[PDB]
Design an enzyme around this catalytic site. Sequence first.
Site, PDB file in Angstrom:
ATOM      1  N   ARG B  14       0.815  -1.210   0.000  1.00 11.45           N
ATOM      2  CA  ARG B  14       0.000   0.000   0.000  1.00 11.45           C
ATOM      3  C   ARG B  14       0.851   1.264   0.000  1.00 11.45           C
ATOM      4  O   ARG B  14       1.046   1.875  -1.042  1.00 11.45           O
ATOM      5  CB  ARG B  14      -0.949   0.005   1.202  1.00 11.45           C
ATOM      6  CG  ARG B  14      -2.212   0.858   1.026  1.00 11.45           C
ATOM      7  CD  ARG B  14      -1.933   2.341   1.149  1.00 11.45           C
ATOM      8  NE  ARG B  14      -1.292   2.662   2.420  1.00 11.45           N
ATOM      9  CZ  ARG B  14      -0.868   3.874   2.756  1.00 11.45           C
ATOM     10  NH1 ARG B  14      -1.020   4.883   1.912  1.00 11.45           N
ATOM     11  NH2 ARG B  14      -0.290   4.077   3.930  1.00 11.45           N
ATOM     12  N   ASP B  15       1.362   1.655   1.161  1.00 12.36           N
ATOM     13  CA  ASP B  15       2.179   2.857   1.246  1.00 12.36           C
ATOM     14  C   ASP B  15       3.337   2.807   0.256  1.00 12.36           C
ATOM     15  O   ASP B  15       3.551   3.743  -0.511  1.00 12.36           O
ATOM     16  CB  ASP B  15       2.739   3.040   2.667  1.00 12.36           C
ATOM     17  CG  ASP B  15       3.319   4.443   2.905  1.00 12.36           C
ATOM     18  OD1 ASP B  15       4.143   4.602   3.835  1.00 12.36           O
ATOM     19  OD2 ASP B  15       2.944   5.389   2.174  1.00 12.36           O
ATOM     20  N   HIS B 206       5.327   5.408  12.201  1.00 13.99           N
ATOM     21  CA  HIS B 206       5.498   5.252  10.763  1.00 13.99           C
ATOM     22  C   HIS B 206       6.586   6.227  10.307  1.00 13.99           C
ATOM     23  O   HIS B 206       6.290   7.364   9.966  1.00 13.99           O
ATOM     24  CB  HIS B 206       4.169   5.583  10.065  1.00 13.99           C
ATOM     25  CG  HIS B 206       4.119   5.192   8.620  1.00 13.99           C
ATOM     26  ND1 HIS B 206       3.612   3.984   8.196  1.00 13.99           N
ATOM     27  CD2 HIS B 206       4.542   5.836   7.508  1.00 13.99           C
ATOM     28  CE1 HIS B 206       3.726   3.901   6.883  1.00 13.99           C
ATOM     29  NE2 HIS B 206       4.287   5.012   6.440  1.00 13.99           N
ATOM     30  N   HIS B 208       9.648   7.593   7.781  1.00 14.13           N
ATOM     31  CA  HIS B 208      10.178   7.532   6.427  1.00 14.13           C
ATOM     32  C   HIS B 208      11.675   7.800   6.534  1.00 14.13           C
ATOM     33  O   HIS B 208      12.112   8.550   7.410  1.00 14.13           O
ATOM     34  CB  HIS B 208       9.458   8.540   5.523  1.00 14.13           C
ATOM     35  CG  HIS B 208       8.159   8.021   4.982  1.00 14.13           C
ATOM     36  ND1 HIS B 208       8.003   7.621   3.672  1.00 14.13           N
ATOM     37  CD2 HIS B 208       6.985   7.744   5.597  1.00 14.13           C
ATOM     38  CE1 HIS B 208       6.794   7.118   3.503  1.00 14.13           C
ATOM     39  NE2 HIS B 208       6.156   7.179   4.657  1.00 14.13           N
ATOM     40  N   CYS B 239       9.559   9.962  -0.854  1.00 17.59           N
ATOM     41  CA  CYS B 239       9.069  11.209  -0.290  1.00 17.59           C
ATOM     42  C   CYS B 239       8.625  12.009  -1.517  1.00 17.59           C
ATOM     43  O   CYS B 239       9.443  12.643  -2.183  1.00 17.59           O
ATOM     44  CB  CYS B 239      10.205  11.930   0.457  1.00 17.59           C
ATOM     45  SG  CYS B 239       9.707  13.167   1.704  1.00 17.59           S
ATOM     46  N   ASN B 248      10.106   4.514   2.662  1.00 16.25           N
ATOM     47  CA  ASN B 248       9.793   3.951   3.967  1.00 16.25           C
ATOM     48  C   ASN B 248      10.967   3.220   4.584  1.00 16.25           C
ATOM     49  O   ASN B 248      11.956   2.943   3.919  1.00 16.25           O
ATOM     50  CB  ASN B 248       8.621   2.980   3.854  1.00 16.25           C
ATOM     51  CG  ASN B 248       7.304   3.681   3.723  1.00 16.25           C
ATOM     52  OD1 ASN B 248       6.844   4.331   4.659  1.00 16.25           O
ATOM     53  ND2 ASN B 248       6.681   3.565   2.554  1.00 16.25           N
TER      54      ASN B 248
HETATM   55  C1  LIG Z   1     -13.194  11.860  -1.772  1.00 10.82           C
HETATM   56  C2  LIG Z   1     -12.272  12.781  -1.086  1.00 10.82           C
HETATM   57  C3  LIG Z   1     -12.977  13.221   0.210  1.00 10.82           C
HETATM   58  C4  LIG Z   1     -12.112  14.100  -1.887  1.00 10.82           C
HETATM   59  O1  LIG Z   1     -13.187  15.008  -2.322  1.00 10.82           O
HETATM   60  P1  LIG Z   1     -13.710  15.373  -3.807  1.00 10.82           P
HETATM   61  O2  LIG Z   1     -12.872  14.569  -4.921  1.00 10.82           O
HETATM   62  O3  LIG Z   1     -13.375  16.864  -4.052  1.00 10.82           O
HETATM   63  O4  LIG Z   1     -15.297  14.963  -4.142  1.00 10.82           O
HETATM   64  P2  LIG Z   1     -16.266  13.861  -3.315  1.00 10.82           P
HETATM   65  O5  LIG Z   1     -17.741  14.179  -3.453  1.00 10.82           O
HETATM   66  O6  LIG Z   1     -15.734  13.710  -1.884  1.00 10.82           O
HETATM   67  O7  LIG Z   1     -15.987  12.528  -4.185  1.00 10.82           O
HETATM   68  C5  LIG Z   1     -14.745  12.119  -4.826  1.00 10.82           C
HETATM   69  C6  LIG Z   1     -14.791  11.248  -6.080  1.00 10.82           C
HETATM   70  O8  LIG Z   1     -14.295  10.084  -5.467  1.00 10.82           O
HETATM   71  C7  LIG Z   1     -15.115   8.878  -5.568  1.00 10.82           C
HETATM   72  N1  LIG Z   1     -14.904   8.065  -4.337  1.00 10.82           N
HETATM   73  C8  LIG Z   1     -15.218   8.275  -2.945  1.00 10.82           C
HETATM   74  N2  LIG Z   1     -14.848   7.308  -2.141  1.00 10.82           N
HETATM   75  C9  LIG Z   1     -14.266   6.403  -2.985  1.00 10.82           C
HETATM   76  C10 LIG Z   1     -13.587   5.039  -2.818  1.00 10.82           C
HETATM   77  N3  LIG Z   1     -13.488   4.515  -1.633  1.00 10.82           N
HETATM   78  N4  LIG Z   1     -12.996   4.230  -4.056  1.00 10.82           N
HETATM   79  C11 LIG Z   1     -13.070   4.760  -5.417  1.00 10.82           C
HETATM   80  N5  LIG Z   1     -13.739   6.140  -5.642  1.00 10.82           N
HETATM   81  C12 LIG Z   1     -14.281   6.864  -4.423  1.00 10.82           C
HETATM   82  C13 LIG Z   1     -16.537   9.465  -5.846  1.00 10.82           C
HETATM   83  O9  LIG Z   1     -17.485   8.504  -6.458  1.00 10.82           O
HETATM   84  C14 LIG Z   1     -16.157  10.779  -6.696  1.00 10.82           C
HETATM   85  O10 LIG Z   1     -15.831  10.469  -8.115  1.00 10.82           O
HETATM   86  P3  LIG Z   1     -16.203  10.501  -9.748  1.00 10.82           P
HETATM   87  O11 LIG Z   1     -16.626   9.034 -10.107  1.00 10.82           O
HETATM   88  O12 LIG Z   1     -14.869  10.965 -10.434  1.00 10.82           O
HETATM   89  O13 LIG Z   1     -17.383  11.560  -9.909  1.00 10.82           O
HETATM   90  C15 LIG Z   1     -10.840  12.007  -0.716  1.00 10.82           C
HETATM   91  O14 LIG Z   1     -11.096  10.798   0.045  1.00 10.82           O
HETATM   92  C16 LIG Z   1      -9.937  11.474  -1.850  1.00 10.82           C
HETATM   93  O15 LIG Z   1     -10.289  11.330  -3.094  1.00 10.82           O
HETATM   94  N6  LIG Z   1      -8.649  11.146  -1.404  1.00 10.82           N
HETATM   95  C17 LIG Z   1      -7.604  10.635  -2.195  1.00 10.82           C
HETATM   96  C18 LIG Z   1      -6.755   9.749  -1.299  1.00 10.82           C
HETATM   97  C19 LIG Z   1      -5.249  10.078  -0.996  1.00 10.82           C
HETATM   98  O16 LIG Z   1      -4.718  11.150  -1.536  1.00 10.82           O
HETATM   99  N7  LIG Z   1      -4.630   9.079  -0.116  1.00 10.82           N
HETATM  100  C20 LIG Z   1      -3.263   8.751   0.290  1.00 10.82           C
HETATM  101  C21 LIG Z   1      -2.985   7.681   1.171  1.00 10.82           C
HETATM  102  S1  LIG Z   1      -2.385   8.218   2.816  1.00 10.82           S
HETATM  103  C22 LIG Z   1      -0.644   8.284   3.111  1.00 10.82           C
HETATM  104  O17 LIG Z   1       0.055   7.946   2.123  1.00 10.82           O
HETATM  105  C23 LIG Z   1      -0.087   8.682   4.397  1.00 10.82           C
HETATM  106  C24 LIG Z   1       0.154   7.560   5.389  1.00 10.82           C
HETATM  107  O18 LIG Z   1       1.028   6.655   4.820  1.00 10.82           O
HETATM  108  C25 LIG Z   1       0.728   8.149   6.658  1.00 10.82           C
HETATM  109  C26 LIG Z   1       1.979   8.828   6.657  1.00 10.82           C
HETATM  110  O19 LIG Z   1       3.071   8.174   6.666  1.00 10.82           O
HETATM  111  O20 LIG Z   1       1.966  10.173   6.628  1.00 10.82           O
HETATM  112 MG   LIG Z   2       3.854   6.834   4.708  1.00  9.16          MG
END
Ligand SMILES: CC(C)(COP(=O)(O)OP(=O)(O)OC[C@H]1O[C@@H](n2cnc3c(N)ncnc32)[C@H](O)[C@@H]1OP(=O)(O)O)[C@@H](O)C(=O)NCCC(=O)NCCSC(=O)C[C@@H](O)CC(=O)O
Ligand SMILES: [Mg+2]
Lengths: 296, 296
Positions: B14-15, B206, B208, B239, B248
Site C-alpha cells: 500500500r504505502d 510510521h 520515512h 518522499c 519507507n
Molecule cells: C473523496 C475525497 C474526500 C475528496 O473530495 P472530492 O474529490 O473533491 O469529491 P467527493 O464528493 O468527496 O468525491 C470524490 C470522487 O471520489 C469517488 N470516491 C469516494 N470514495 C471512494 C472510494 N473509496 N474508491 C473509489 N472512488 C471513491 C466518488 O465517487 C467521486 O468520483 P467521480 O466518479 O470521479 O465523480 C478524498 O477521500 C480522496 O479522493 N482522497 C484521495 C486519497 C489520498 O490522496 N490518499 C493517500 C494515502 S495516505 C498516506 O500515504 C499517508 C500515510 O502513509 C501516513 C503517513 O506516513 O503520513
Molecule cells: Mg507513509
Amino acid sequence: TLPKRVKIVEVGPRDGLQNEKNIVSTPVKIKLIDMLSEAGLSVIETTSFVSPKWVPQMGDHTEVLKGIQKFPGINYPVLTPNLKGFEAAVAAGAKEVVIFGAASELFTKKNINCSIEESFQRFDAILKAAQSANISVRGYVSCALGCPYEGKISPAKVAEVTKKFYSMGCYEISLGDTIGVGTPGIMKDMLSAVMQEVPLAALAVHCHDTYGQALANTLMALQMGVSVVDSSVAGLGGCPYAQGASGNLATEDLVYMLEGLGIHTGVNLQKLLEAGNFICQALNRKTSSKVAQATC
Amino acid sequence: TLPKRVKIVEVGPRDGLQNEKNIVSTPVKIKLIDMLSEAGLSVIETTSFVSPKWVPQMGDHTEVLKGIQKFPGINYPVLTPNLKGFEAAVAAGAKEVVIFGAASELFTKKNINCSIEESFQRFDAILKAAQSANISVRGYVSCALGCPYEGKISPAKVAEVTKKFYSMGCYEISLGDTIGVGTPGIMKDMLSAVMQEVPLAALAVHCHDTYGQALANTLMALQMGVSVVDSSVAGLGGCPYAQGASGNLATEDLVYMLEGLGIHTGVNLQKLLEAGNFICQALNRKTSSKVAQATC
Ligand SMILES: CC(C)(COP(=O)(O)OP(=O)(O)OC[C@H]1O[C@@H](n2cnc3c(N)ncnc32)[C@H](O)[C@@H]1OP(=O)(O)O)[C@@H](O)C(=O)NCCC(=O)NCCSC(=O)C[C@@H](O)CC(=O)O
Ligand SMILES: [Mg+2]
Ligand SMILES: O=C(O)CC(O)CC(=O)O
Ligand SMILES: [Mg+2]
C-alpha cells in the site's frame, strides 16, 4: 544522557577512499581534504603511510600530507602500520598517528599472522617512538560488535584490548563495527564493558552501515556517553569482509541527527554536502548519504 | 525500556507501492502480499479503497483484497477515506479499515481535500458503522514530526488529533513522519505529549527514511515503550514532497535490528527478502534494504 557536543572524526579520505573501487588523483584528494577542512571538521583522517605494494589507493600518502592546507586547530591524523611507515609519517609532518588492532584472534592471524598479543609488541615499538617524538597516537579496535570469522565477540575481550591500548599510550580508541553487523543491544553491552576500564572521554565509535545499523548503533553510543564518532563523507568506504552492501556511516547523515538533537558539532552541513558531491563526481559514484539525496 | 515483542505492520503493497513511479499488475500485487503472508508478517496493509482519480496505483483495490489469500491469524487492513470507501471494503471482505488524517492543517487540505474538523465528521461516520459490525479501525496521523507545508508541528497538536481518533474508536493510531525529517529528540517529545492522552498499546510509529533517520527515530519509539512499527518491504515508496530519495523504513533492516535485540517479530527474514526481491524486479528497481544488499 546525551553529550552537549560531539567531535566528528571524518575518515572519508582514508577509510573511505581506500575502500573505494575507482581511484582519484592526488590533487583531487587534496581538494577533498581542503573542502572537509572548510566544512568545519576538527579532525580529518588524511592518508596511511603504508607500503604501496599492498594498499595502492594510498600510495600518494607522502605528497597528500604535505599538500593539504593545515587549518588552525584541525587535526590530520595518519595511519602508520609499522615503524617504517611511522618514520615516513613523522618526516612528512604528521603530528598524530593511528594504529589498528582487533578484539578478534582469527581476524588478527588472517591479517598479520600474529595472535592478539603478538600484535602489541609491534604497536609498542611505534608508541615508544611516538612518545619521545612527542607525537599523539590514536587506536583502532575493529570487530568490536562482531567478527566475520569468530562471529560474536565477548564485550570482555573488546575491553581487555582497549585497556591494553589506552594504558599502552593511545589517548583515544575507536571501537569499530568493521563489518556493520551489530545492533544497539551489542553496542550497549560492548560499551558497558569498556567504560569500566577506560575513561569515557577516550572512547570513540566507528560503525559501518553494511546492514543499516550504523546510525542507530551510534545513537546508543551517544546515550552511553561517548562523545566522538567516526564517519565518511558521502558514505564512501566499504568493508572487504562484507558483500556488495555499504561501508562507513554517512557524515552528512550523522550531523543531521546531531543538529536535530541540538548537539554542537561545529560542522557546516551545506559546505559538507558540497565536499560529498565533489568527491562523488571525481569518483563517478552516487553518494550514500540520504541527506545528500534528499537535496539533489 | 524495549518491548519483548513487536508487531511490524507491513505497508509495502500500500504505502510503498502507491508512492512508486512504475505501476504494477493486479496479479503481482497479489503475489507480493501472498509472499509477505508467507514471510511471517501478522499484518499487511493490502490496499486503499480510494478514487482512481487521486491515486490510480490503488485502483485495483477490490479485486486485490478479494484475490489475496487470507492466511490464518494475519490481518489485512485497508485504507478508507470517506464512507464510500469503507462501505466498499466491507463488501470486498475487509475485516479492518484505516482512516487517515494529519496534525498538519495545510496537509490535510491536499491529501483528503478537507480540513481537520471536517475529517472528524467523515471518520466518525466510518467508526460508527464499523463498531456495530466488528470492523476494527486504525488511523494515520501524518506530519507527526513535522509537515512539508507548515514546517514545525507541535507535539500537543499531535496529541490532540491522536486523542480524538482514540476517543472515537480507533483501536490503534499510527503517528507518521511522512517526510522523514525527524530526529530522536523530536520523536521523543512527540511520543511524550501523546502518551499523556492515549495509552501506549494503541500507539504505533510510521517513519520515512528520506534523511536516513527512520531506524534511529524508531529505536527512540521502542525505548519510549511503543511496540508496533510500520515499514515497507524493499524500502519501497518515496518522499513525493521531497527530492527523489528514500521512502519507507526497510522492513528487512528493521527485523534485523529487532532480532539482534532479541525481540520477537515472528518474521522469517529469508522469505521476507525473497518477497523483497520479487517486487523489486517486478518494479524493475534496486532494493533500498541495506540487509538485502549485504545478503547478496
Ligand atoms: C473523496 C475525497 C474526500 C475528496 O473530495 P472530492 O474529490 O473533491 O469529491 P467527493 O464528493 O468527496 O468525491 C470524490 C470522487 O471520489 C469517488 N470516491 C469516494 N470514495 C471512494 C472510494 N473509496 N474508491 C473509489 N472512488 C471513491 C466518488 O465517487 C467521486 O468520483 P467521480 O466518479 O470521479 O465523480 C478524498 O477521500 C480522496 O479522493 N482522497 C484521495 C486519497 C489520498 O490522496 N490518499 C493517500 C494515502 S495516505 C498516506 O500515504 C499517508 C500515510 O502513509 C501516513 C503517513 O506516513 O503520513
Ligand atoms: Mg507513509
Ligand atoms: O576499515 C578500517 O577502518 C581499517 C582499515 O581497513 C585498515 C588498513 O587497511 O590498514
Ligand atoms: Mg572502517
